[PDB]
Design brief:
The structure is cut from a larger assembly and holds one copy of chain A (about 140 residues), one copy of chain B (about 300 residues), one copy of chain C (about 190 residues) and three copies of chain D. Chain A is mainly α. Chain A is about 65% helix and about 10% strand. Chain A has helices spanning about 15-25, 45-65, 70-90, 90-100, 105-115, 115-135; strands at about 5, 10, 25-30, 35-40. In chain A, strand 1 and strand 2 form a beta hairpin. Chain C is elongated and about 55 Å long. The PDB classes it as rna binding protein.
Chain lengths: ~140, ~300, ~190, ~200, ~210, ~210
């Protein structure tokens, strides 16, 4: 997708999404049992809430025939960054996830591109983050 | 007056060889002549020009890259040489001299992109209303690539050339080959003076190669066969007309030397009569167009 | 071709239309025709002690479908295999051209057998799961690779198979074998 | 002898499945041009549908039908005056479908429910997408000057019957509805005056 | 030979789900979407769905022979109206039912008030054993949306037309008390044919009293 | 083939919350929205929820088989009333429960009293060790709201109908003692079922005795 280049110039892609989940995967033997911990404590439910936010914007644009992002869609994107910021402030693990995956930075790029394809590409990357988080847990 | 006649096909053509299922990428000069006669009869023109002065060639493959003539039957990886059927005009002299190699022949075979053959499975519902059944049948068609087309060279006097221009324009609407009037064979045709072929034809070689599917008269046949490398092609079919007979009638079976056949002694052809007691004479072109080459 | 061929095919639902090294034509049940075609390639190499390779085209057709059409289409498949990679066989479609060893082991043994044993053991899985997997593999979108991984995690198939399927999907050659292996299994499982 | 050209356009009003493999893959495909892979309407399907509708209206075996669409009957060998060619997916439809990345043909998912076991059996069919246009070409051969008008009236009737009917496919279940837009009716061969002739 | 055109509207009383597959779905999105016209991206009611549901309801109303395996074993009225396929008894269908298309007026009524044509519905299934809920999202067409319908009736035998139309009315009546599409036993696909317009578009048949 | 139509009203005895998903929420506002009809933006009761709760209540009441894993393993009465997708034993559902829409009578009643249809309840989860709280704001339909329920029953077997309607009455009784929607064990979702008219809308079946 070539969505973004991260600090040190690494590309953002579905393969990158698998790698970012892999780097932030630790095995902590809590109560003897080995337990997988992603992004220093990110939970499935928090990531699902973040995925729900993307879905509400996605159903609008994905259904929409028009390529350029609608002004309300751009509003929802700005709200998404406000929700990202809120969840990052309310949970350190979510802040770590946003910092490592650069999802908040990408939404600004999607607003700059004003393209359905870059939006669909951002949605794909977020979905891969969720899918890989499920696979590596 | 040799005039190139390039045909561009808008819809796939059938060009049946023995059955409706099969298809060829080209048609014999006789099939074209029969279409020209049928057209002239529709347009109420005199058949004397076509039957006495018109000399034609089998339709040959053409590409934006090249124009392809038939492979001469001259003794020279035998598979690669046998697989090759058409040689570009520029490579014809090289093939005749033997300068071509098996890999070069493979490249020449790969060079032609006349088109992509296919089989369309149609149904007949004529009996469904009479407690009968649908009847599947297959029509073999050939779709030319957009640059690719079939060309033929026509020789004759000015009068027959103009008559040919008129018949050709009517023919494009009529179409050519089988299942024409059922979706196939619509073509658009250009008639032009070709510097390439006329220069090529102005050669006096030691061998003669048959451009058109042709047969010699009995007296011509005895001199012509000596030292001839050739391929007798059966020329058979039904009579297509409304006035020959009340029912459909097969034509008398005819055998003609194929295009690319090489005869040491040139023979002129003849418009044979393959009719058998009909209300008109079914003419079968077998006249000969010759490309003289040096071997 | 004329004598050993009868013993090679013995016990299989196959009818030999014609034989010979020039051209071989057999009509048979599809699972039997494929298995006997592999047996024949191994026998031919043994009989020739190598240095001899056979190229074949295998096609699957409904019994009512016309023989002439079967012969023509399968001729084209044989031609595909013959033009390049002459030892390799072409199976069912122009898209699927495989080396005989690849078809026998890298597809019908390494991938089809695990998937077959896994499905039978699982009470929680079915053809529908295999159809879901096939749809992701067929689409070939990068996202489907990720979506297959989510499906695999939900599926709970044995980890080594889960990882093996994931690896196969990421490799282009393995995925065509994985698609073919799944399709062969679906044809076999289907009643 | 005269040849009159009728060049026009066919608009797909419901998905069209002219028809003419792998498991979990479309089970019925559409007829497509082999080099361009574009969907096409065979010139035989239009001819047969028009002939059948005209037969139902008139009634086949009527002299008008045989002279319009050809006949090989013993003593009644008649050339087909109507030479209907294959209709090709139009360039304009290609441009519009390329914008918005619209596929030319869409898979349709259907099933049948048995009257015995109530078990659904899935089928996937390919239909040319609604909003598709085909450039259709027709050639009329004037075998008789005195029967041109009536023949054209017959043609008109058939086309009208076709506009309230479907083209080849499962059209009784919502498929193959078409509209005809006659762009031109021109005389390509001869001096015949075809300005008054009309298909619609 | 006459053709009578029945044109009108179908109104979604409760949310309508006629599924259409072929597309991989995004994680967390709708698993089972509705069939939509590709060009307009607007939902459509396939003519095959309407025809099949009407034929099934009419067959149940008229009656089914014991152990009826095929659709060609239906009553002669049903085979006459919707078509037959028996060997040597192929009956052309008098009814050609077209795909219903979302009404422009319903589209305007939704574009104003800014309402989406389709609604996501969040359901779950609760295991009999673990009592564990597994969620799902299904797309449905909204209640306010209306679909224009178009049907053609061919007058092949002028005598039976009245009776045939009676059957059609009966079938439509059944379809009004039944549902359309999938999931209709849990509250989906209730419709009504509030708008009808019958006119002989081809021929000279009298459809004034039809 | 007869269709019997039951119409009536479901009355909210206690605040009723049926979860909906994908609804954007303001920070500090309602974070648990109830299901709403997209057109009218009014609370709706999904027929899927009613059917699921009635089927589960009835199946548990007559008695689950030991180690039951699927819904298709329910008692034959439940399978006949609510359907069955069992391989080789597919059974039709005679009950067709539909979406219950917010009645105009209750809506006008609320508008007279200037009351909103959906109340907001403030709840919290308190840790029983650190006494740390996690506040939640939920949405519940206001008590006294009424919903128009519409259920279609199909008379497949005339003999079975009386026992089937007895089972439906039992399921209604179960759902009255039981709640509908979520958080019922915390008081939410108590409901009442009243009947307007049980009428046979298709066929000649006599539904007056029911």
């Amino acid at each position: 997708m070539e969505l973004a280049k991260t600090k040190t110039g690494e590309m953002i892609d579905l393969n990158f999404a698998r790698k970012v989940v892999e780097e932030n995967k630790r095995v902590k033997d809590n109560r003897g049992r080995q337990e997988i911990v992603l992004f220093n404590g990110l939970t499935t439910s928090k990531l699902r809430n973040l995925l729900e936010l993307i879905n509400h914007v996605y159903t609008k644009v994905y259904n929409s025939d028009d390529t350029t992002l609608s002004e309300d869609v751009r509003d929802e994107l700005e709200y998404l960054k406000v929700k990202f910021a809120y969840e990052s402030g309310r949970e350190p693990a979510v802040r770590t996830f946003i910092e490592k995956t650069y999802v908040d930075k990408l939404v600004d790029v999607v607003l700059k591109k004003n393209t359905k394809k870059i939006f669909l590409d951002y949605c794909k990357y977020f979905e891969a983050l969720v899918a890989y988080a499920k696979f590596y847990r | 007056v040799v005039k190139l006649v390039k045909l561009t096909f808008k819809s796939p053509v059938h060009f049946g060889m023995k059955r409706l299922s099969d298809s060829n990428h080209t048609i014999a000069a006789d099939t074209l002549f029969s279409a020209l006669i049928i057209e002239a009869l529709q347009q109420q023109l005199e058949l004397s020009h076509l039957l006495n002065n018109l000399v034609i060639t089998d339709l040959f493959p053409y590409n934006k890259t090249s124009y392809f003539l038939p492979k001469p039957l001259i003794r020279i990886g035998y598979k690669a040489f046998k697989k090759l059927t058409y040689i570009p005009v520029e490579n014809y002299s090289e093939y005749l001299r033997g300068e071509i190699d098996s890999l070069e022949a493979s490249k020449i075979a790969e060079s032609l992109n006349l088109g992509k053959a296919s089989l369309s499975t149609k149904v007949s519902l004529q009996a469904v209303d009479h407690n009968g059944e649908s009847e599947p049948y297959s029509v073999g068609n050939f779709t030319f690539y957009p640059e690719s087309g079939l060309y033929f060279l026509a020789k004759g006097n000015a009068d027959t050339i103009g008559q040919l221009e008129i018949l050709m324009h009517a023919l494009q609407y009529s179409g050519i080959g089988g299942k024409r009037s059922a979706g196939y064979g619509q073509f658009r045709c250009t008639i032009e003076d070709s510097g390439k072929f006329d220069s090529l034809l102005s050669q006096t070689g030691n061998i003669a190669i048959l451009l058109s599917s042709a047969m010699a008269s009995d007296e011509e046949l005895v001199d012509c066969l000596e030292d001839a490398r050739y391929l007798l092609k059966k020329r058979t079919g039904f009579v297509q007309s409304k006035t020959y007979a009340d029912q459909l009638v097969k034509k008398k079976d005819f055998y003609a030397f194929s295009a690319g056949s090489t005869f040491y002694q040139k023979f002129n052809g003849k418009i044979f009569d393959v009719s058998d007691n009909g209300r008109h004479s079914v003419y079968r072109y077998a006249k000969a167009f010759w490309l003289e080459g040096k071997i | 071709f004329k004598f050993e061929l009868s013993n090679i095919l013995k016990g299989a639902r196959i009818s030999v239309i014609y034989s010979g090294g020039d051209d071989l034509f057999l009509i048979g049940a599809w699972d039997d025709v494929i298995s006997k075609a592999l047996v024949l390639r191994k026998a031919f190499t043994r009989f020739s002690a190598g240095k001899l390779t056979f190229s074949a085209g295998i096609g699957m057709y409904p019994v009512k479908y016309p023989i002439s059409k079967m012969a023509s289409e399968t001729g084209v498949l044989e031609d595909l295999a013959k033009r390049g990679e002459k030892n390799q066989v072409a199976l069912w479609n122009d898209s699927k051209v495989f080396g005989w060893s690849q078809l026998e082991e890298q597809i019908l043994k390494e991938k089809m057998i695990p998937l077959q044993e896994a499905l039978t053991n699982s009470q929680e899985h079915g053809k529908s799961f295999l159809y879901k997997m096939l749809e992701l593999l067929r689409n070939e979108d990068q996202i489907n690779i990720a979506r297959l991984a989510y499906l695999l995690a939900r599926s709970s198939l044995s980890e080594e198979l889960t990882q093996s399927i994931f690896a196969w999907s990421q490799n282009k050659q393995q995925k065509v074998e994985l698609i073919t292996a799944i399709e062969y299994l679906v044809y076999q499982i289907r009643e | 002898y005269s040849k009159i050209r009728i060049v026009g356009k066919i608009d797909v009003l419901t998905g069209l499945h002219i028809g003419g493999s792998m498991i979990g893959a479309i089970a019925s495909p559409v007829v497509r041009d082999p080099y361009s892979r574009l969907p096409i309407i065979p010139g035989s399907s239009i001819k047969g549908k028009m002939r059948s509708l005209l037969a139902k209206h008139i009634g086949q075996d009527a002299p008008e039908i045989l002279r319009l669409f050809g006949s090989s009957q013993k003593g009644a060998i008649q050339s087909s005056r109507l030479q209907i060619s294959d209709a090709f997916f139009s360039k304009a439809s290609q441009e519009e479908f390329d914008k918005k990345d619209l596929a030319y043909t869409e898979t349709k998912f259907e099933n049948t429910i048995s009257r015995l076991t109530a078990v659904a059996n899935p089928r996937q069919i390919e239909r040319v997408t609604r909003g598709a246009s085909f450039d259709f070409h027709i050639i009329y051969n004037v075998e008789n000057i005195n029967e041109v008008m009536a023949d054209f009236e017959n043609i008109k009737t058939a086309i009208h019957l076709l506009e309230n009917d479907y083209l080849g496919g499962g059209g009784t279940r919502g498929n193959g509805r078409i509209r005809f837009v006659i762009d031109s009716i021109d005389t390509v061969v001869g001096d015949f005056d075809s300005s008054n002739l009309s298909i619609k």
